[PDB]
Design a protein around this ligand. Structure first.
Ligand SMILES: NC(=O)c1ccc[n+]([C@@H]2O[C@H](COP(=O)([O-])OP(=O)(O)OC[C@H]3O[C@@H](n4cnc5c(N)ncnc54)[C@H](OP(=O)(O)O)[C@@H]3O)[C@@H](O)[C@H]2O)c1
Ligand SMILES: NC(=O)c1ccc[n+]([C@@H]2O[C@H](COP(=O)([O-])OP(=O)(O)OC[C@H]3O[C@@H](n4cnc5c(N)ncnc54)[C@H](OP(=O)(O)O)[C@@H]3O)[C@@H](O)[C@H]2O)c1
Ligand SMILES: NC(=O)c1ccc[n+]([C@@H]2O[C@H](COP(=O)([O-])OP(=O)(O)OC[C@H]3O[C@@H](n4cnc5c(N)ncnc54)[C@H](OP(=O)(O)O)[C@@H]3O)[C@@H](O)[C@H]2O)c1
Lengths: 247, 244, 247, 238
């Protein structure tokens, strides 16, 4: 129970990878405060799966791209729990299109949620962590941020951006004993991959030395490592969890 | 005359590194189309220095963060020169602050000029280069995009973003023979640099000195020429050994 | 105990970081097989510390640069314990000098122990792991393998080489479900660290964002992560444990 | 003529990429001193092609894995041309095999030539370059040194090692203004379907492409670049 009584904030906790991160942290003893934006019922369900592990949990609506929402979100976290030991910046979206026809709003929305939202949530949690002289920030990037991917210029830019932001953050907060790292998932069995056709899946599997999509638990286990004392001398790093796709 | 007959578009060409890029490309025979945003007098100085090399040059006012300005800019470039063979995305700004104190405006302005502007200009030039089945795009990043830097969350995010965008662009445009690369300057002597801050910066550079705008221009020229035709999706650090 | 019943081979396990890796893996329930050279005294101390955790342990004399020694070492590991679940390639030496002054034997000795030793041990364990359709290899590199270091051309080349070899190995063994990763330590405390001049310590700590040397437990914890189910979708990676020295 | 009056030493100059590096440097006005090991007839052909550009050229037998050969090679280079301005460490071999079947000799031969050879030549040229307070060293790596490649554990280890060595050399020699960099070729056409699929540009590169990257890193055009690896691989590794 390596996180017993820690307080973890998880953005995008209402479903997918974020829900499984919340549950995994709860399994290790962390109390959870997470957000949702468009899915209230999904948040109820995360909250019940988390509560089964005997920790305290609270959900709150917040759009991470909106500074006002992010400010109220962290204020309430601190009101409820007094501290934030772990922040997981997991909220993210895709709006895939060829660069040549990519719409300005497809660009803006992905940059604003994925990159700016991570900046906003980092900014809002920074003072509490600096006063605590302790904290872990885990940003959710993607291995395509490392290598590029046709049809995803906005997403790639946002995730490469997050990796750069992770480094600056790590440099700024390191003197107060705060670890800041990123996880870079490859292709994980999720709603994203559930929508794909056989030819597309086949070509994706061919890029993975292990020959299979990862699981949400693989990603949660990386976040857990980076949220715990087991990684206390690691900062400013991106951990790729991608079956060998990017070496 | 490595670029004789070529047309190069340079964003941020009115001063500094962009001015020296434009002059260097002109010295190799390229006609230059470049933008300015708030410095018409500087733009006219650049134009004169470019024209001295025997090529044609035009400057046009445009904000690279604004989609409508970018569309008009590239429209006018094609009306003036008939084609675009080289795009150098050099326009960029900084609005430094500790991340805990960084204002939403400081974040947005830097992301929109440095990163969105590079996207918009790349998008604008892409169909033209695809039709030509030839082209070079050189994006200006920074070594702080590679390693991070305290006080520059926005700038670092934008430049690391540019590096990723460079790679996606290279992938999308490679089937039509277009090269797409990035140059990552370290500490370069300019008006902006010329404290104890300087001595601490020098201690980070194995060569022991700031670089010159000509060093950066020379990297850009290499990546814009036939000498680098099998190079794509790469970032070239021009930093005196600061980041290895 | 997350490695209950596993067998770990740790090269260089008789002292320093190697010893602390062997002890950490023993505390998670792994039986330990390790090599030594010269006097058995350090090896005797390691075996004692390991056995206090209630697992089985055997030391064997073997020089990792020597093919014959390696062959016999792995044969005896199989004879003694049945299988090899984890291999930690930690054997390593330095012979520092500026390039101008570096002797040919100083070059060869370091390349042979650090790089060739990793190759020979990897080769020796590979058929066993392939047959098992399971296994973890963790190679010990160094952050100077990533960025270079004056006076260490041989050491740097060897550890950079080890990082490349890690990637080839991961590629060749991925189809049998074997994970292969590297750990890159930064500046880690030894019992001489405290004795250094203040000027010396300050110049080293200036290069580290976290502002302190790491511990051998920090390194052992990263190895443990990479030897466990928690990292089963991670392969071909180098994990830097360096307080942010290299980002 | 960017390199008029310069003296370039090229290892592995008798064939393939090294031959074209030598020619390209000559084209820019450099005198050329290069080695061969097993191919004197190919070395004569290289020398004739270099001599077309009006520069002086000499070939000399040397195994870069042998310290005595390397010392004599560099000694003769200095005797012949007075100085060395540029060193290109291009000699290299492959001896492929799956890790589990790879022989100790296949490992040793590739490490000794590709990595130890680059160390030995770098060591030999370093004193004269330091005394000059000028020089350029370009090492030949490979993109598989960056990402790994099944069947090539020896080659990959050797080239990844060269990249690390490049960084150390760059740091040790930067105080006297010597630039040290590496070129990492992808698939280059030398003397199919699956290789091409991995290259975004959709074609193998040419020896001229590699030669042009070497020339850039050997010239004043790159004087602020050191400790870098330039991948010339049609986008294979980004
Ligand atoms: N799936 C993969 O294979 C994969 C690969 C690489 C990286 N990743 C990264 O891992 C993270 C999670 O991915 P996923 O596949 O689990 O995505 P998902 O299933 O779509 O879940 C996304 C989560 O983010 C939240 N979210 C979206 N927009 C938001 C906004 N404006 N404000 C606040 N929250 C918002 C959603 O909340 P609501 O639904 O309540 O709005 C939801 O809980 C993402 O950052 C993604 O880029 C995933
Ligand atoms: N100096 C260095 O050491 C260094 C290091 C790393 C990276 N870089 C990068 O290299 C590039 C140029 O650097 P520099 O030092 O030469 O910069 P600089 O002298 O400050 O010039 C910046 C240029 O960007 C233009 N610009 C500003 N806002 C704009 C907008 N909204 N739309 C269009 N153009 C705009 C300016 O034109 P107006 O004056 O007309 O507005 C100006 O010509 C930048 O991308 C920079 O980030 C420089
Ligand atoms: N071709 C590619 O696609 C590719 C890809 C990645 C990297 N590279 C690298 O680029 C470099 C050139 O390769 P290449 O394809 O052009 O090979 P190559 O010329 O066909 O043959 C290797 C060259 O190295 C010399 N050589 C071999 N062993 C030697 C020794 N012990 N001492 C001295 N010289 C020796 C040979 O000389 P003799 O014939 O006289 O013995 C020959 O000139 C190599 O380092 C290679 O690893 C090439």
């Amino acid at each position: 129970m390596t996180l017993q009584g820690k307080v973890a904030v998880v953005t995008g906790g209402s479903r997918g990878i974020g829900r499984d991160i919340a549950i995994n942290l709860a399994k290790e003893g962390a109390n959870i405060f997470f957000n949702y934006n468009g899915s209230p019922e999904a948040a109820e369900e995360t909250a019940k799966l988390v509560a089964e592990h005997g920790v305290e949990v609270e959900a709150m609506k917040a759009n991470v791209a909106i500074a006002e929402d992010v400010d109220a979100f962290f204020k309430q976290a601190i009101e409820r729990f007094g501290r934030v030991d772990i922040l997981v910046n997991n909220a993210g979206i895709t709006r895939d299109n060829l660069l040549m026809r990519m719409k300005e709003d497809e660009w803006d929305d992905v940059i604003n949620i994925n990159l700016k939202g991570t900046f906003l949530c980092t900014k809002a949690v920074s003072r509490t962590m600096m006063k605590q002289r302790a904290g872990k920030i885990i940003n959710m990037a993607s291995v395509v941020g490392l290598i590029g991917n046709a049809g995803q210029a906005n997403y790639v830019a946002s995730k490469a951006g997050v990796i750069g932001l992770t480094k600056t953050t790590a440099r700024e907060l390191a003197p107060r004993g705060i670890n800041v790292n990123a996880v870079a998932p490859g292709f994980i069995t999720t709603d994203m991959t559930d929508k794909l056709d056989e030819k597309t899946k086949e070509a994706m599997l061919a890029q993975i030395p292990l020959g299979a999509y990862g699981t949400t638990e693989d990603i949660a286990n990386a976040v857990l490592f980076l949220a715990s004392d087991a990684s206390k001398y690691i900062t400013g790093q991106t951990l790729s969890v991608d079956g060998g796709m990017v070496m």
